[PDB]
Amino acid sequence: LHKEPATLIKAIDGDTIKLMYKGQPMTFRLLLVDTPEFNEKYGPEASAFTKKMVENAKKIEVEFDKGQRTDKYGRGLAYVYADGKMVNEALVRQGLAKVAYVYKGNNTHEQLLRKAEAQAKKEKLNIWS
Ligand SMILES: Cc1cn([C@H]2C[C@H](OP(=O)(O)O)[C@@H](COP(=O)(O)O)O2)c(=O)[nH]c1=O
Ligand SMILES: [Ca+2]
């Protein structure tokens, strides 16, 4: 897989971000994770975590997987990086997202994220507390 450039348009919530990609505004949904909705427990914390991570970043990138690049809502499906750190993994490591929505053929980073989730669970962080 390979990283491509994007720029932040607006934080939305823990697992969706509005980015400009190839010059076009798009909502991206983070592959292989599920944050709580803003109205659920840890929802506000997830949103703030993602927001901080993408607003502080000098460089945003998106990485598509091998399979579908947009979902049925027209959201881009990618791993999103902030100054080289994957947001998807960072949410999971902090106990602010569960590994989820693992579809065959868009699951390149599945085991990386499951290792993060195991460590968040051992530490009893956030969702796992
Ligand atoms: C993460 C992801 C979500 N989706 C769809 C499945 C779910 O459909 P439903 O809307 O029918 O529940 C929805 C979950 O996204 P949200 O967690 O953003 O609601 O997005 C995909 O199709 N592919 C994906 O890779
Ligand atoms: Ca969600």
Specify the 3-state DSSP secondary structure of 118: helix
Known binding residue 34? Answer is yes
Write down the experimental method used for this entry. X-ray
Mutation choice for ligand 1 from 29, 37, 77, 103, CB with most ligand atoms inside 8 A: 29
Minimum-distance ligand 1 atom for the alpha carbon of 72: 22
Tokens matching residue 114: 């499951």
Known binding residue 27? Answer is no
Long-range pairs for 38-42 at CB < 8 Å and ≥24 separation? 38/13, 42/95, 42/96, 42/126, 42/127
Alpha carbons within 13 A on the beta-carbon side of 13: 14
Whole-angstrom distance, CA of residue 99 vs CA of residue 62: 19
> Which residues place a Cβ less than 5 A from the ion ligand 2?
34
Specify the 3-state DSSP secondary structure of 2: coil
Distances (CA, A) of 94 to 8, 69, 102: 22, 26, 19
- Main-chain dihedrals φ then ψ at residue 94, nearest 5 degrees: -90, 5
Looking at the structure of the chain, the number of domains it has is 1
Whole-angstrom distance, CA of residue 129 vs CA of residue 14: 18
Least Cα distance to 65 among 51, 84, 78, 75 occurs for 78
Residue 24's contacts (CB-CB under 8 Å, 6 or more residues apart) are none
Least Cα distance to 4 among 22, 17, 18 occurs for 22
Residues that are catalytic: 29, 37, 75
Residue nearest ligand 1's atom 11 by CA: 72
Residue 83's CATH number: 2.40.50.90
Domain that holds residue 62: 1-129
Distances (CA, A) of 3 to 66, 78, 81, 82: 13, 10, 8, 11
Q: Is 27 exposed, middle or buried (0-12, 13-18, 19+ CB in 10 A)?
A: middle
Tokens matching residue 42: 């840890």
Residue nearest ligand 1's atom 23 by CA: 71
